[PDB]
Chains A and B, each alone.
Chain A
Amino acid sequence: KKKSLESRDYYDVRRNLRLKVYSVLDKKLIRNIRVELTFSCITSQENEEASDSETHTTEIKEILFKVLGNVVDEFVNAVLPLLSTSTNEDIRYHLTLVIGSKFELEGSEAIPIVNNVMKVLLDRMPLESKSVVISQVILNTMTALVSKYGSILTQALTLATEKVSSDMTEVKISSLALITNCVQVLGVKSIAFYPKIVPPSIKLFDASLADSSNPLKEQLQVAILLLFAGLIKRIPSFLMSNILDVLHVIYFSREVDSSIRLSVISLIIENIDLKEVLKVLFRIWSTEIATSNDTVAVSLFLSTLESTVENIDKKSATSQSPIFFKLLLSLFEFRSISSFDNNTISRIEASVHEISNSYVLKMNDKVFRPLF
């Protein structure tokens, strides 16, 4: 293959590669293995020259498939000492895009292979820092590895993702580091790296508000909402008083789609603060979620009220009943303040009257006399 590459018909070379793939595709090499380092380096140089020649496209894919089948023990032990020896960044990125697919097909037996390769991949992520494509590919690969599964490797990958997220200031790198922090929050929901959600809100949500059509907000705000909901779903009581900025981002996320935003709101509703939502919704209902008047958070403000009014109201809501009827009075008073689309204002007033009827059914006899 290197002789043909140093030589370079093209369709003749493609037919030669397809005949090579149909000839080579194995267990002969497996019976040779089970010397060994020489065979690993020989198949690694074969695969590296194969990617340098192929980095008729389906014929090149079949040749790479035969090379990946013959050359995840072998695919891991080849690249583990050659993740620096892969010279060009294009060959490195193609090798990383093949290695995760060849690795995450089967697992659950050999944990220590990935547990000692995770430090190597995180060091390759820290060394190849000026290659953003390789950085995002390493982020996706390490996130898939943490979803497959090691405390030192977990802390190293989490710190690399936190440093790739906090000082990111780049669209694709920030979106990729947010996914790595999300998968690490799903795997090891540690209390450490406390500067995680407070950095993500004021960084990414404000950046998506500042970038109107320049950046991919359809690629940014959805992942930001999923990360903000997954963090509070993992650590419930650690954000039982810090939920207001999360609800503000999930409500004013105009880039987020309707079903995704509704699912995020439902997850935040069934999440923490079963009583502390009545002391939380009032600030957004006064200042935040009622000054927009572009229907986006207007569809969701009454839904966020109805969630805690029809799924969480209890004796704790009877104890905190004053803010409940206070928010009811503010909602019934803001009708003329909502001065756009008066028929929709009447529809929202009907929804507010129904939620107020539910709150009045929840409120008992002695609890509402001063409220009366």
Chain B
Amino acid sequence: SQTSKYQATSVVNGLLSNLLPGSKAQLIDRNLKKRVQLQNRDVHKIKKKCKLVKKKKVKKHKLDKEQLEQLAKHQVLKKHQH
């Protein structure tokens, strides 16, 4: 429930700086060895994408609130000069 949701939230917050996804044992060993080759990923690029998205939402909220404060200053100067 909420415990599992907060646990997954803290896990994803910890792994946000990890950027990872989420019996034929010779095949398992070879797959785990080739996963070291596949581990040369574009995690810096996807982190730049997420950071630019966060910067975009931050600039959007800051510009909207600053325009709201400008309208507040216009209304307060209007009600003052009245």
**Interface residues of A, Cβ cutoff 8 Å to B:** 27, 30-31, 34, 105-108, 133, 136-137, 140, 143-144, 172, 175-176, 179, 182-183, 186, 216, 219, 222-223, 226-227, 230, 257-260, 262-263, 266, 295, 298-300, 302-303, 306, 341, 343-344, 346-348, 351
Contact present for A262 and B36 (CB under 8 Å): yes
Separation in Å of the B28 CB from the closest CB of chain A? 6
* Contacting residue for B76 out of A34, A133, A186, A216, CB 8 A: A34
Contact present for B13 and A179 (CB under 8 Å): yes
Across the interface, which residues of B come within 8 angstroms of A303, CB to CB?
32-33, 36
Separation in Å of the A56 CB from the closest CB of chain B? 20
Sample of 15 more A-B contacts, CB < 8 Å, known A34-B76, A302-B33: A27-B68, A106-B65, A108-B58, A140-B13, A143-B10, A143-B13, A172-B7, A179-B13, A223-B11, A230-B17, A259-B20, A263-B39, A303-B32, A344-B26, A347-B29
Separation in Å of the A220 CB from the closest CB of chain B? 9
B44 within 8 A of A: no
The number of A-B residue pairs with CB atoms under 8 Å apart is 114
The contact sample of 20 A-B pairs, CB cut-off 8 A, is A27-B68, A30-B69, A34-B76, A105-B58, A106-B65, A107-B58, A143-B10, A144-B13, A216-B7, A219-B11, A223-B14, A258-B32, A262-B32, A262-B36, A262-B39, A263-B18, A295-B23, A343-B26, A346-B26, A347-B29
Separation in Å of the B55 CB from the closest CB of chain A? 10
Q: Roughly how many angstroms separate A260 CA and B32 CA in the complex, as a whole number?
A: 12
Separation in Å of the A248 CB from the closest CB of chain B? 18
Contact present for A348 and B29 (CB under 8 Å): yes
The 8 A CB mask of B69-80 against A (1 = contact, 0 = none) is 101100110010
Contact present for A347 and B26 (CB under 8 Å): yes
Contact present for A299 and B39 (CB under 8 Å): no
Across the interface, which residues of A come within 8 angstroms of B7, CB to CB?
172, 175, 216, 219
The 8 A CB mask of B40-56 against A (1 = contact, 0 = none) is 00000000000000000
Across the interface, which residues of A come within 8 angstroms of B28, CB to CB?
295, 299, 344
Across the interface, which residues of A come within 8 angstroms of B8, CB to CB?
219
Contact present for A222 and B26 (CB under 8 Å): no
Separation in Å of the B52 CB from the closest CB of chain A? 16
Contact present for B20 and A31 (CB under 8 Å): no
A106-B58 contact, Cβ under 8 Å, with A31-B76, A176-B10, A226-B14 = yes
Contact present for A298 and B20 (CB under 8 Å): no
Separation in Å of the B59 CB from the closest CB of chain A? 9
Separation in Å of the B67 CB from the closest CB of chain A? 11
Contact present for A266 and B36 (CB under 8 Å): yes
Q: Roughly how many angstroms separate A348 CA and B62 CA in the complex, as a whole number?
A: 56
From B23, which residue of chain A is reached at the shortest CB distance?
Answer: A295
Separation in Å of the B37 CB from the closest CB of chain A? 11
